[PDB]
Every structure is written in C-alpha cells, then in structure tokens.
C-alpha cells in the first residue's frame, strides 16, 4: 500500500524536486524488502529504464547516465515506510514519468509520479 | 433525468383540463427499468420466480 | 389531551422543543446503553462524565438554496472540537458512544420543499482519481458541513472525493438510502426530524480519531420552491447529543 | 411459510388505513383487504430460499493463477481476499459486518505447452498447496526450505482424484469481519483510507512437487470460497456501479437506472 | 425476467380533480413513490444478477 | 449419536446426520434455519402506530 | 384518536378516501338491502353479480365557472353504458338497485363558493312548449351532465325542457329542495358530499330503460369567487356506486 | 395382485350379462364365467411393472452435443426440453399433465482428432458443466467471467471417474407441467400456437476447463433424463405418426394401421 | 432412523433404507406404490349399471 | 420463435414488398440481439449472400450492391418482436428466397420468405 500512488509534481527549474513514495506493509509481507526506482522518458525513447536501486540493504546510483550523482534517498532508514528520493538539480530534460516500486513478498506496490519543470 | 435527482420526482400542476394521466408503467418489478434498481428490484434479480402483493406509497 | 405532533427532549442542561414533529426513529430498535461485563475487553475501569459529555451540541447552520445538492457530517469528528466531549477523547485512547440527531428546518405554508435525514454507519466514500483515496480534509470538515456536487467531479491526479449526489459518494442508488434509520422533512407536514442511534461497530470500543462510526447526510429529493415576495433565506440547524458515552485508555492529549 | 389472505366485505367507516405519513419513516404494512374486497386464501408458500444461509452458502470462483514445471515462474502466491471476484464480492457487500465459517475447494488442471522436445514421457503430476498465516515466513524459491510445512497446514493432491477441500474456522481479531471501514489505519490519518487489520486470513502457495516430464507443462489453480454458518448485521443498499479497484470503493458515476421513451410508456 | 405468458398488469395515475392553489403560491408540485413488498411475498430459484459485470480480476 | 431431522418437502421425509469431526466448523451449513423479524427495519419508531388510527 | 371529518368507503375493487368530509346521509334512514320473499312478485330466481355490478363508477368531470347555473343527472341512465352494470340491464327486463353518491370538489382557503348536492326521486321535468313534453335526448344525457339555464328557456313549438334554475324544471321553489336527502359543500368547510340512497319505487321492481327512479342535482346557491393570481379552473367529479343490485327477466339484449 | 377366476355351472335364467349397450360409454366388465363354465383358479400374478413410476422411471438419452479444446466452437449450450428424443417424449405424451422430480446423469467421452502436431502430451482432461436458470446471464465466450458460477449450480468432472449426477426438484410456475397447450401466448392470438411459459427449466453449458494437449481433441456430452416421484392426469391416445418438429404436434397423415391380404386372413 | 421394508419376492425378504440428504427430492423412486382405481375411466356414468339387469 | 417462419409473398412490380419477421423471445434468451437478413438469388449464383445486418444496436445497409438504398427496417424499435424490412422498388430481379435470422443466445430462430414479382 503506497499513499497517493498516482500524482503529478510541478516545480520550477533548479528548485530540487522531492518525490514522496511512503508505503505501509500488511502482516502477510515477510519477504526481503526490494525498492526499484525506474524512470520513463518524455523523449519517447526506450521506457522503463531504472535510475536508482535499493536491495540487500545496499544502494546503487548508476543505472541512468543523465542523472549522475543527483538522485539520493531522502531518508536513511529506508526500511521505514518513507522510501523517497529527491533530484537536486532540476533540468528541462527532467520532465518525464517516474515509477516507484516497493516489493515485499507477498504483494508488490507501485507509485507513478509525473514531473513537469517550468 | 436519470443522471439527476429529477428521475425520482413526479411532476403535477394546475391544468385547464380533467382526466389527464399523471404517469403510467407496467407491473414488472424484476424487468421494468422503473423497479429494476429498487431494494425490491435489486433483490428480485437473484431469483427466478416471485409471488406476492406489492405496496406503492405516494407522498 | 396531548398532541401526537408535539414533543420535548431533555439531555444534560439542554432542552429542545418541537411543536410540529412526525415521530422518533430509535435506530434498529436498540436504545443507547453502557457496555456489559460480558462483552467488554479493556480491563481498566471506564470513565463516564455523563452530564458534561452527554448534552445537546448545536453545529453551524447551512442555507437551503434552490440548487443545493446536499450536505454530510461525520458524527464522531463533528463534536471533536466541542465541549468536554471533544476534550475527553483527546485524552482517551478508546471511546464508545450513541447519538440523537435532531435536524431542524422551518418554512411558511406557501413555501414547498422536501429533505431526507438519514444516519449511515461506516459510510466509506469513493474518490474521483479511481487509484487514490480521498484526503482527510476533503472527507472530514470539523466545525463545517461538507457539501455534495450536482455535476460529476472531474477525474485527474489528486485526492478529491466523488461528491456525485446520485451515487452519494458510495456508488449506490440514492433512493436505496432508506434501508438505514431515516426520517423525511416536508415543509407541508414536518418542521424537524429526530433520530436516536445506538453505538454500532464490530469491536466493543474503538479509537474516535482515525475511525468514524456513523455519518449524517441531509439530501433534498424534491427542491425548495416558492413565489416572489416570500422569504429567500432558509437555514437548517443540526443539533447532536452524545448518549451513554464512556472512555478507556487515559494518556497524554494528542492524535 | 407466509401470511394467509383474510376475507373482507365492503366497509364504510372513519378508519383510514391507506392514509398515513411516510415522513415517520414507518412502513405502512397495509394488506390488500384494507383497500379492496378479498376472499380467504390458505397460502402454503414458504420463504426458505431467501434466508442468508441459503443466499450466501454457495461455492464461487474468487481467483485463478498459473505456474510452470520449468522456466522463471515455478510457483504461484495469492493473498486471501474475496474482493478479487465481483460476483461473490457484491453478494457479501449487501451487509456491513458478516461473521461466517469458510470452506476452500481447489480445481487444478495441467496443459502441455508447445515445445520441440521429443520422446516426452509424463509421470502423474503431484501438486502441493501450502497455507501461510499472517506474519509467517514466505518461500523465496520453489526449492526453498519453507515447503517443509512443519506448523503450516498444507495439502498434497495427485491428478485424477477428487479436488482437495479443507474447512477454515472464522478468523478475525475483531468480533466480526468488516466489509466497509471508514477511516485511516494511522492515528495521524496519513495512510491509505479504508485499510483495516481486520479480514486478513493468509497467503496460498501452489507448486509442482515433481517436474513430471522433460517437455514444458503449465497448470492453472482456481480457488473457490463457500461461506458456512453465516451471520449478517446492518443491511445496506446493493452496489449500483461496476467495481474498479478491490482496495477502495472508488467508482465511476453511473445513471441511477436505464431510460425510457417517456413517462406513461409501458415498454423499455 | 420479462415473459408474455405471465403478464403482470398496468399501473396508471390520473387527475380525479384539478390541483387548486391560492395567490402567491406555486401551481407546480412533485410526488414521491415508495415501493415495498407485502407479508405474502416469496421468491425461488437462486440465480446470478446480470447487472454486475467483470472482464478481468481487480 | 445420530441426529434425525425432517427433509424439505412440498405442501398440500426424514434424514439421519452424524458428525465425524470434533472441529464443529467442519459441519455442514444450517440450511433449515428460517426465522423472520422485519419489525426493526420496517418500524423502528418509538411510539407504536395503529393502522386504524390516523398517523398524525 | 380518529378525526370526525375523515372517512373511507370500500365497494368492490374501488376505494374512495376523503380527508375533509362533513358526514354521510343515509337516505330516509333506510340502508340498501335485497328484496324479501314477502314483498317480491317475479317468481323466477333473481341474479345478483354483486362484485361486478356494485362498484364505484366515475363519470366525466364538469367545470364550476362563476356563472355556472347548475347540472343534473339520471342515476339509472348515467351508468347504463358503464361496466357490467350497463350490460346486465341490457339483458334483463326488471332491475332493483340502491346508490351511494359521492360528489367531489376541492379549492384553496382563498377560494370561496357554495354548492347543493341533493337526490330527487321521480323528478318529472317540465317543458317550455306548455303543450308538448321534453325529448329523451334533452332530458337524458348518458356519459354527460345536463346543465340548467339562468335566463328562462324561450317558449315555441318544440320539445325543450324548461331549464329555469329557480323552478329547477319541476315548477317548485329551489330553496324547498332540502326536504329530499341532501348535503351542502362549502369551500370553507367541506371538500366533498356523500349520500346513500335506498331503492324507492311504488312497484317492487321496474324497467331501468324507459323509467328513472332517482335524479342527482348539483346547484350553487352562492357563486364561485376568488381574487386574481388564483386557480381559474375548478372541476367537480361525481362517483356513483350501485348497492344490492339484482335483476329478473333474462332476454335478448336491447331496448 | 389380480382377480381370481370363480368356478361356475350351467345357468338358464332371464339374467343377460353379455347383452348390454356400448352407447352408454360404460365398459361391460364381463368376466369369463358369465358366458362359459370355468373352474376356480387362484391367480398369483401382480400388476407391479405396469405402474407409472415403474413405466416412466428409467434413464433415457435426450440430447448429445460436442465441443473442442481449440478452434471456433469451444463450448456447447443446450436448453432443457425432453421433446428432443422421440422415445422418452412419446412415453411422456401418454398423459396431458405430468408432475415429477428430475435426475440428470451426463456421460462425457473425448476423441483425439487427426492432426500433423507432433510430440503430443495429454493431461487428464477436466470438464465443467454449468446450469443456468431462466433469465440468468449466458456466457458469450469460453473464457467469459460467467463461468464463476457464484449462484449458478455447476459440476466439475475429471475423466476416469463415475459420471456426474444431480437431482432437480419439480420446477413449474403452474401446479403441473403441461404436455399439450391449446392456445396462443399472446392475448391477441398473434404468435406461435402452443407456446407456454410452463415446462421451462434452464440451459446447460459444457466446456473444457484446460486445453490438456497441443493436438486437437473433441468431446461429446450425452444428457440423460430419469423422472422420479412421477404423477399423471387425464390419459390420452398414444402418438400414431412420426414426430417432425419438437415445437408443434405437426404430423404427416399416416395409415390407421398396416393392411392384410383380405378380411378372414389369419396372417400379415 | 433406518426404514425397514419388504423386498419384491415371488409367490407360491427385507431391506433397510436411510436418507443422507434433507432435500427429499434427492430420494430414490417409490417403486413399491401399486394402487388401482379404473372405475373412473371404465364407468364414469351417473347411474350405476348392474350386469344382471338389462342396460336399457 | 418467429410467427409463420415458412411463407411465400406475391406482389406486382413497383408495389413495395413488406417482409414480416416478427419474433418472440423465451426467458432463457439473455444474450445480445443480432439480426441478419441474408438473400439467396433465383439466378442460381452464390447463395446465402447477406443484404442488411443489425448488430450492436447499429444498422449496415451495404452487403449486396443490387439493393442500394432500397432495404430499410420498417420498425425503429427493432428490439421489439417486430423485426421487418420493406423493399421500396420491386423489380424483376427481386424474385428469390429471403431468410431472416434472429439470434439471441441461447437459441437461434430463422424465417424463409419466397418473393415473386408479377
């Protein structure tokens, strides 16, 4: 269960966009926690491209070149419901669809955020 | 009118005439559109046969 | 030689008097009473103020216009900021209470209109997004009355409750709302509607903050109409009094 | 049985049963004899099939999923919830709180997939279905150590036999299951609205005990939910619009009913 | 279900007398209809309701 | 310990049932449980209303 | 706690309901009953349909204008083309029946008017010629209501009934019409008038075609009046139900 | 049992039992002893097998249809009516009105069709038969959502097991089923003559739950109708000519009986 | 609640039957129900006709 | 059930032939209504050729060229039992066999009309 999974965020250029993907786990959920942030470009090029991954209690920040050292998890707990990321340098390219996936067996939850930069 | 609260209301007025019809509908609670969605009609759709009297209250 | 359409209810230090009422609907035939020692769960002694908590609390009035779609209230939430009742729950973990809903509205013989007063327990309301859930602010309006929308609420990415009056936000026929305890006010016969509701929940007692047991909805099936030179402004006052309230789980105030 | 009609004669009097007030919220309950002359009739009709036990006690398919004897997907996991199927769900949503015993029946069928494999010899396929309680460990892989089922109830079924059936007692921390929850799980009201710790039963895991054949085989498992010893409280209006999401009562605004050419019209 | 053999009947309403109102009073009113069953109403043959439809699982 | 009960028959015979499990939730449905109490839904009013007498 | 001015009459499959009535006038104190074996004459067994023949038959409405002189009806003739009753007499030589006349008329408090409802047996009516007799068409109007004339009917060579309202066509004072069973409708007190008439004739049974036993006359002594912006059109509906009807002399239909 | 012959002696008297009148419509009921000398005989023969329950209570095939596991035709639908088969139908038409309980048994057999498909592996085929009441929704396609059977009785059968059997109670709005209806459904008499709302039971839908094999398979389902607790009213003459249409008693004129060379001839 | 009845035997023994369903329409056929009343079909006349006496 | 399914209609040239295909539905019938008018030519050329089709509450009038804008459903309800068509301009070619099919699952009803033009 992710709060407000479908939503749209609007921010000006260079304003630092914070994407909220706070979740809540059911009793049945007892599997390993796996977070996957995949971005779909507005360019209409190949979609479902991953940017940042959190698995095995470890973080990977190199899955998409354009965002190099710009995506960091806002919270350091991460196991806690709050699993959010913030882009420091908002750019014209940033415009696109961002999908947040929280996978704890059994049950997978997904959140989609439309990002527009003025 | 079915998309508004006007479907339930029934109009009447002062007319220079007599013997006119306020409304008309058949006795089909299960099938007729008028009763197909009432508490009676909703329950009558899970059964094949129905036998008994019906009470109509006009306010 | 009493009159059938004449009544008076006295709770605490407040008295209401109606000289044109239809009757009193006592829920599903159950009268508000305290928790028995067989169905209880919390081992700690319950606290019952009784006089302070149980008394009539008058909410803000609303205007009945010719295009008014309808209004709704959350009974536990509505009285959360009024009197000791509001304070009591702020300091208590559990709470179990019953209510008496006296909707008041009056008009002249010449004025013609019709309203529906109904108490709907566990009224889970839908959202226009069809993927999100309604926000707390949109669903709950303390010290106010949330209104219904005639035209359907626009669908987009947000948290707005579908206020559609015909589905009533529960995706059910508005005409089938009479199954729950209800009463009708017609400005040709009634001047008020009084309903007594017993506490109804799956659990013996529940949190009064995040959880709302019942919901009061006033909807006009036939609109308010009148000829010129008549009174244009017609208000509606809702008075709600808790009955047999009792709380458990004393703690620091907050939510 | 039902009430017997009572014979009546023409009556002229001050008594006025038909005249009444609907504002009181009281049903008029006027028999046919009050407004017209009737003949005594001995009705023998009985309201037997309209009881809640008769209405809700039928097997209804709630969810079907498939798994393979090879490839990536080797096991199937489903959490117990009756909102998956609109039919059984709509019948259950008729009331607010329902308390009942549950009976589970599973139908399993295996279909051979197209392949270039030759000399395929198939051995009687055996399927294992394991029920996991809330908070219990969930198997990561098909050949995981969890499938030991030491304290988890599980059933082993061999093809060509009658479908496996087990009876579950009412499980709910609360006194009764809640169909509709108005509120938030969080005391701060910052979570998915309508989420409840109530109505949580468990998760079902289905896999092939043995590969059986060199060639690929895919099997679909259908779960049937039959309520027993059911109880109902607070009746509510039936669903008018089509279900969109199982989690929330979210709906699309729908016309109160179908239209007709005009009033006074006897046909649709 | 609709069936010609077991035809029910026709329910109509007419004006016995004209509606009469005084001055400064609306001549246009509305009526409400409430339909319930009697104490001799029964049903049989449990069948599924057509109204609810589903193409995929939720 | 066999329970003999009457079968559902038309108007105008018996069956024997035994329980082989001590679970009790493992028993068959109570199909023959016909009880009617609509008074609460139809008339939940405080004062009883006689049909002969006028409502108001 | 019944109301004196509240009533309901149930005959056959028809029910009338009045919420503003004065009382019920039962003829000369005699209630419609069947023929006894001592006062009978026709030796053949009488046929009594009872449910089909005895039931409320609503005639066409009339408009009460400010200059309306009055209307009249022939009770046996009026129902001659309606239902089984009309068919029954068409096939029977003799016929003996009683009637219940419920005249209905309603108006707002602001409207003021007055009407007289009276049943006159054997109402032989005069003719303007003073040498001829009124024609069947002029005297009898089946499926219609014959009206009275304010100004006197012109005298000439023809068959026209003197419709003079003051003599009422019987050459008697209109004010002396209260001797027969009657009731008054005033739009300030009454909304209807109900009269029960027993069968009255010299012979035990008589032909229902050429002979008319009773006649219903509605005359307004004080005219209908109201201020502008009020309802101009005011109708009057007459509902007549036969009581204890029985026929003798089965034959081929006709007259 | 039957009546015992009574011994008689030569009798000369005015009594004339043989002489009678057939115009009265009364059967003469003359025993052998009235017209000839007989010996007392203790008959032990019993009229047990000639009873209506014994005559009509036998399983008779009424309709068989087929379906496939692939291709256009994937499911088979048949409306319940016993006029499909001439045998059971003729026995039932002996009376005017018959009231009885019904028992249904289904025999299902699958035959592999010719194909160029290779490496065919077959999995135990499971067949689902669903009964739909009048006015109930009918499945548009094989993979339709209707097959959930929430409130519709359905039976799942796996090959290699005894045939599925269910018992149906007498269903008729009327007091008894009517074999022959004289009239029109329409009050205006402008419709198919003999059509009745009576004798309407339901529709049977049969399909394969799983494909089972890559190669094509065709299965034929046979429906058997066994009447139980039968009752008969108004006996009528047996059918003389062959049945043409199930809907109407339409027939072709047929010779009263077979001919012989001449009268006085002892052979056919 | 077992019903013991006589089996069909020749002239010149017992069987026990129990009902496991409350449906009653789920019972076996009533094979042993032999009753004869042809009087209505053979002689539905108003006046009884004695064989010894001549018809007319 | 279609009233008088087998019948023969005789009309003179240019007299407008009305073909009656009035049906009645059984309770079991609960499927979508599909009407199909197929004509078999007296020419002895390919038979079972459709002329006018009514499905999905929509009408198609172009399945046979000879009858261009000449076949119209007589009734506008169509759901009602009356499902009849009328040819406005009777011609010598018109002579042939016309089949009317009313398909409402379960159960299919067919009516065959022989048309002769003098």
Strand content of chain B: 25-35%
Following the backbone from N to C, one meets helices and strands of chain A in this order, namely: EEEEEEEEE
DSSP E strands of chain B, number: 4
Instruction: Report the span from N to C terminus of chain B.
Output: 20 Å
Largest interface: C-D, 57 and 50 residues
Shape of chain B: elongated
Quaternary state reads part of a larger assembly
Percent of residues in helices of chain A comes to: under 10%
Largest sheet of chain B: none
Strand order of the largest sheet of chain A: 1-9-8-3-4-5
Strand residue content of chain A: 35-45%
What count of helical segments of chain A does DSSP give?
A: 0
**Cα Rg of chain B:** 15 Å
The helix content of chain B is 10-25%
Head-to-tail CA distance between termini of chain A: 31 Å
- Principal-axis shape of chain A: globular
Number of domains of chain A: 1
Question: Please, how many helices of chain B?
Answer: 2
Which class of secondary structure composition applies to the elements of chain B?
alpha+beta
Function (chains C, G): Forms an icosahedral capsid of pseudo T=3 symmetry with capsid proteins VP2 and VP3. The capsid is 300 Angstroms in diameter, composed of 60 copies of each capsid protein and enclosing the viral positive strand RNA genome.
Protein name (chains C, G): Capsid protein VP2
Subcellular location (chains C, G): Virion; Host cytoplasm
Subunit structure (chains C, G): Interacts with capsid protein VP1 and capsid protein VP3 in the mature capsid.
Task: Give the topology.
This is part of a larger assembly, with two copies of chain A (118 residues), two copies of chain B, two copies of chain C (255 residues), two copies of chain D (268 residues) and two copies of chain F (56 residues).
Chain A: E1 6-11, E2 17-19, E3 34-41, E4 49-55, E5 58-60, E6 71-73, E7 85-87, E8 96-103, E9 108-117
Parallel strand pairs in A: 1-9
Antiparallel strand pairs in A: 2-7, 3-4, 3-8, 4-5, 6-7, 8-9
Chain B: E1 10-13, E2 21-26, H1 33-36, H2 39-43, E3 47-51, E4 54-58
Chain C: E1 7-11, E2 14-18, E3 24-25, E4 57-58, E5 62-63, E6 71-74, H1 75-78, H2 83-91, E7 92-104, E8 114-121, H3 136-139, E9 146-147, E10 182-186, E11 192-197, E12 214-219, E13 235-250
Parallel strand pairs in C: 3-11
Antiparallel strand pairs in C: 1-2, 4-13, 5-13, 6-9, 6-12, 7-11, 7-13, 8-10, 8-12
Subunit structure (chains F, I): Interacts with capsid protein VP1 and capsid protein VP3.
Lipidation (N-myristoyl glycine) (chains F, I): 1
Subcellular location (chains F, I): Virion
């Amino acid at each position: 269960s992710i709060t407000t999974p479908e939503e749209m965020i609007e921010k000006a250029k260079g304003e630092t966009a914070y994407l909220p993907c706070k979740f809540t786990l059911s009793p049945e959920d007892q599997g390993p926690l796996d977070i996957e942030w995949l971005i779909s470009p507005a360019d209409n090029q190949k979609v479902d491209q991953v940017i940042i991954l959190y698995s095995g209690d470890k973080i990977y920040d190199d899955y998409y070149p354009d965002l190099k050292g710009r995506v960091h998890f806002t919270s350091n707990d991460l196991k806690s419901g709050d699993a959010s990321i913030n882009v420091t340098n908002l750019q014209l390219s940033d415009i696109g669809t961002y999908q947040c996936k929280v996978k704890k067996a059994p049950g997978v939850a997904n959140k989609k955020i439309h990002l527009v930069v003025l | 009118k079915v998309n508004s609260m006007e479907a339930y209301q029934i109009p009447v007025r002062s007319n220079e005439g007599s013997g006119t019809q306020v409304f008309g509908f058949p006795l089909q609670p299960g099938y007729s559109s008028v009763f197909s969605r009432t508490l009676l009609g909703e329950i009558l759709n899970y059964y094949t046969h129905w036998s008994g009297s019906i009470k109509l209250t006009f306010m | 030689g009493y009159s059938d359409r004449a009544r008076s209810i006295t709770l605490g230090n407040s008295t209401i008097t109606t000289q044109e009422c239809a009757n009193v609907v006592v829920g599903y035939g159950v009268w508000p009473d305290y928790l028995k020692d067989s169905e209880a769960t919390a081992e700690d002694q319950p606290t019952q103020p009784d006089v302070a908590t149980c008394r009539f609390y008058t909410l803000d009035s609303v205007q009945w216009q010719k295009t008014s779609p309808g209004w709704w209230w959350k009974l536990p939430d509505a009285l959360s900021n009024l009197g000791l009742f509001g304070q009591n729950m702020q300091y208590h973990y559990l709470g179990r209470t019953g209510y008496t809903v006296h909707v008041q509205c009056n008009a002249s013989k010449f004025h013609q209109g019709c309203l529906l007063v109904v108490c709907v327990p566990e009224a889970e309301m839908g959202c226009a997004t069809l993927d999100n859930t309604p926000s707390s602010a949109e669903l709950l309006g303390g010290d106010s009355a949330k209104e219904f929308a005639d035209k359907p609420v626009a669908s987009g990415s947000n948290k707005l409750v579908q206020r559609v009056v015909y589905n009533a936000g529960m995706g059910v026929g508005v005409g089938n709302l009479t199954i729950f305890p209800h009463q009708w006010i017609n400005l040709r016969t009634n001047n008020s509607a009084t309903i007594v509701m017993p506490y109804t929940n799956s659990v013996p007692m529940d949190n009064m903050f995040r959880h709302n047991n019942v919901t009061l909805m006033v909807i006009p099936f036939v609109p308010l109409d009148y000829c010129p030179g008549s009174t244009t402004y017609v208000p509606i006052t809702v008075t709600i009094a808790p009955m047999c309230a009792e709380y458990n789980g004393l703690r620091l105030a907050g939510h | 049985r039902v009430a017997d009609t009572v014979g009546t004669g023409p009556t002229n009097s001050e008594a006025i049963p038909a005249l009444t007030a609907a504002e009181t919220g009281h049903t008029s309950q006027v028999v046919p004899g009050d407004t017209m002359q009737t003949r005594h009739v001995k009705n023998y009709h009985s309201r037997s099939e309209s009881t809640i036990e008769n209405f809700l006690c039928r097997s209804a398919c709630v969810y079907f999923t498939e798994y393979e004897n090879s490839g990536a997907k080797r096991y199937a996991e489903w959490v117990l919830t009756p909102r998956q199927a609109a039919q059984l769900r709509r019948k259950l949503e008729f009331f607010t709180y329902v308390r009942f015993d549950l009976e589970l029946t599973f139908v399993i069928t295996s279909t051979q997939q197209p392949s270039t494999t030759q000399n395929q010899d198939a051995q009687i396929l055996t399927h294992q279905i394991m029920y996991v309680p809330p908070g219990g460990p969930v198997p990561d892989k098909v050949d995981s150590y969890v499938w030991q089922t030491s304290t988890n109830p599980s059933v082993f079924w061999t093809e060509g036999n009658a479908p496996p059936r087990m009876s579950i007692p009412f499980l709910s921390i609360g006194n009764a299951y809640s169909n509709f929850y108005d509120g938030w799980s969080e005391f701060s009201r910052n979570g998915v609205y309508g989420i409840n710790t109530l109505n949580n039963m468990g998760t079902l895991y289905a896999r092939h005990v043995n590969a059986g054949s060199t060639g690929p085989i895919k099997s679909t498992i259908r779960i049937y939910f039959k309520p027993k010893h059911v109880k109902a409280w607070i009746p509510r209006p039936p669903r008018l619009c089509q279900y969109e999401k199982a989690k929330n009562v979210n709906f699309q605004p729908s016309g109160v009913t179908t239209t007709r050419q005009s009033i006074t019209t006897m046909t649709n | 279900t609709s069936d010609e053999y077991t035809a029910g009947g026709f329910i109509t309403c007419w004006y016995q007398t004209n509606i009469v109102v005084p001055a400064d009073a609306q001549s246009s009113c509305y009526i409400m209809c409430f339909v319930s069953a009697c104490n001799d109403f029964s049903v049989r043959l449990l069948k599924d309701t057509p109204f609810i439809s589903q193409q995929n699982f939720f | 310990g066999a329970q003999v009960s009457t079968q559902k028959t038309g108007a105008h015979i018996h069956y024997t049932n035994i329980n082989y499990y001590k679970d009790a939730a493992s028993n068959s449905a109570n199909r023959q449980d016909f009880t009617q109490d609509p008074g609460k839904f139809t008339e939940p009013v405080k004062d009883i209303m006689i049909k002969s007498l006028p409502a108001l």
